[PDB]
């Protein structure tokens, strides 16, 4: 099934974005005075709460590239969760047509 | 109907996650200097604003396990709300095919 295939592809891609985003955020934020997103472990946590939209506000990017990385994490997170929902819709719709006799 | 069954199963599971997550967060956060998520009543409120994504930022986990618990709460919340939406889609789609004559 395509909907379950694209969903799985979205989840694995999300994990890649989370890891890479955690790596790129630190690389981008270091060098800017006052930045807190400068260590990998908490950067990964930041990526999670960002991708899930959430955004406690305990950690936030202050640089241009750190914020661009953030946007990518947001979109990847929203798209994946939106794709899972879309996949769940197809499963339920296809199932309802079966118990109806259509 | 499956879509209404999985939705109800998601809502009751969400409540379980909220309660357990409120319990596990306190257990994980206590022992870490500076942690505020250390009492059950406000921990439950934290779980609610976390599961609904949202995240005011008044309460936030600082430990590894407290943050892992948070992620579970997030996913459970997002999945449930995404499953409700998917169930609402199936209801409307199945209804539109009826008033159309298909």
């Amino acid at each position, epitope marked *: 099934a395509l909907h379950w295939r694209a969903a799985g592809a979205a989840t694995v891609l999300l994990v890649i974005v989370l890891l890479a985003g955690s790596y790129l955020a630190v*690389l981008a*934020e*270091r060098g800017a*005075p006052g*930045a807190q997103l400068i*260590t990998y472990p908490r950067a990964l946590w930041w990526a999670c709460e960002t991708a899930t939209t959430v955004x406690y506000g305990d950690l936030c990017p202050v640089t241009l590239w750190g914020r661009l990385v953030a946007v990518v994490v947001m979109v990847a997170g929203i798209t994946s969760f939106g794709l899972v929902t879309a996949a769940l819709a197809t499963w339920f719709v296809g199932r309802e047509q079966e118990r109806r006799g259509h | 109907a499956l879509h209404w069954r999985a939705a109800g199963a998601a809502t009751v599971l969400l409540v379980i996650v909220l309660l357990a997550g409120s319990y596990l967060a306190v257990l994980a956060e206590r022992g870490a*200097p*500076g942690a505020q998520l250390i009492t059950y009543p406000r921990a439950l409120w934290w779980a609610c604003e976390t599961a609904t994504t949202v995240x005011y930022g008044d309460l936030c986990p600082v430990t590894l396990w407290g943050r892992l618990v948070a992620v579970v709460v997030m996913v459970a919340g997002i999945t449930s709300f995404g499953l409700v939406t998917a169930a609402l889609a199936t209801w409307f789609v199945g209804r539109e095919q009826e008033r159309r004559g298909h």
Partner: antibody
Amino acid sequence: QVQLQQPGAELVKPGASVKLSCKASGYTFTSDWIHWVKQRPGHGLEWIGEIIPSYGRANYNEKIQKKATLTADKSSSTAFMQLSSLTSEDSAVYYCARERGDGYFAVWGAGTTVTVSS
Amino acid sequence: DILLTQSPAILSVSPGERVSFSCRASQSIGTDIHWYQQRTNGSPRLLIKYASESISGIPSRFSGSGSGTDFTLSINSVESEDIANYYCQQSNRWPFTFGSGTKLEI
């Protein structure tokens, strides 16, 4: 084994330049940052700058004079600090340290005693 | 940038007595503070990471505490080998900064 190997000493004439080395061993991750710390005789530790060998990007302490230039060689796992236009102020022991990207300096080098004199 | 204040600069104490080093940050840095030990003509050595976490190889004599602004490095019953300079370092905000340091005398 010694994780960070630095030269014992470096003698530099006033105005000249010097390229300090920091050969690294042990476990090496892409998340590793190499830092440099300056310590003048009778003074405390002073952060100079940092560099990530896996990407090559470097940051410097902008609170002090820009005397250093950080480069790295991923082939030999050795970090370098280019000090130029040295005066008597730059005469100090320069340590290099490894950070696993988690904030603390796990291991330090023996330090290179740089003396600026004619 | 974050200023780390270590007072007093020199700390005198009798043998076999508990001692405490102070480190105060100009801003709230949670528990992102790290302690180092530097003996005469030696390189700095990590004693405590993240305010209170122990390090492999370091005697159980050393301990750490504190959060936010005030931090403390403690030594239960000091020994002669503890004679050194003690520095604190924060990793909460860029750039990383060191304290002025505290000298221990017996």
